[PDB]
Design a binder for this molecule. Structure first.
Ligand SMILES: [Zn+2]
Ligand SMILES: [Zn+2]
Ligand SMILES: [Zn+2]
Lengths: 150, 106
């Protein structure tokens, strides 16, 4: 019932999963995925387990996959609602990119924040001026929200 | 819209369409050197931009060269009937013909 592209792409992820990332389709709707990304090492989110929800619009792969953090997180490219501000998910998307492409992008974004592409107002700039402060706050949030693997 | 079939040996990734992930159907090549199914890159150009999806490089519809070498060798590949249940295997070039004689079908 669901497009072959999505069906085939899914098998490949479950088959050769991206390191540090766990993602499976919704046992009730394949267009939805349950993602868990382990906080990168040496990054402020070291030692935390983050949950994200990825959904594939009907126009996919022409339209980009919508992704959002479910686990609270202090990072310049995510807002309070958990939405990710990323290029490849906005205008820089292409029907040639894949789910694995998005999963890898988000993960790199943790190992190293990109304070402008554009950016979620607040944190975006705080990470610019008091980068030391921004980082401790992120470590704090990681211990507070992503260490009880809900 | 590529060839949704089991290729055994499995399909080599060079012949897979980035846009539909099936064996290239009516293979064409872009100035930038990427291959798609003739129908897929037109669909991407018409409503995704006049750029190659693989690298966002300007593309334009009049720059799709028939990849006659790819079309030729993909059609000579061994495949299995995609009628689920059938256990027939032949050169992709002949799949179609076999269809008119499948136990599983329309
Ligand atoms: Zn290209
Ligand atoms: Zn195609
Ligand atoms: Zn058959």
């Amino acid at each position: 019932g669901l497009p072959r592209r999505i069906i085939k792409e899914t098998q490949r992820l479950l088959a050769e999963p991206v390191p540090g990332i766990k993602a499976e389709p919704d046992e009730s709707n394949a267009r939805y995925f349950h993602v868990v990304i382990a906080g990168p090492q040496d990054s402020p989110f070291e030692g935390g387990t983050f949950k994200l929800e990825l959904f594939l619009p009907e126009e996919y792969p022409m339209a980009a996959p919508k992704v959002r953090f479910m686990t609270k997180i202090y990072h310049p490219n995510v807002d309070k609602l958990g939405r990710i501000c990323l290029d490849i998910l906005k205008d820089k998307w292409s029907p040639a990119l894949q789910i694995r492409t998005v999963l890898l992008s988000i993960q790199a974004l943790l190992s190293a924040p990109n304070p402008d592409d554009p950016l979620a107002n607040d944190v975006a700039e705080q990470w610019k001026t008091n980068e030391a402060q921004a980082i401790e706050t992120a470590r704090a949030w990681t211990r507070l929200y992503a260490m009880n693997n809900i | 819209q590529g060839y949704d079939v089991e290729f055994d040996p499995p399909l080599e990734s060079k012949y897979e369409c980035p846009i539909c992930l099936m064996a290239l159907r009516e293979a064409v090549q872009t100035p930038c050197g990427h291959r798609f199914c003739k129908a897929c890159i037109i669909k991407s150009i018409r409503d995704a931009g006049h750029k190659c999806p693989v690298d966002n490089e300007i593309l334009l519809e009049n720059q799709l060269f028939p990849d006659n070498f790819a079309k030729r060798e993909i059609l000579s590949l061994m495949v299995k009937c995609p009628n689920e249940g059938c256990l027939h295997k032949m050169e992709l070039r002949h799949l179609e013909d076999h269809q008119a004689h499948c136990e599983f079908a329309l």
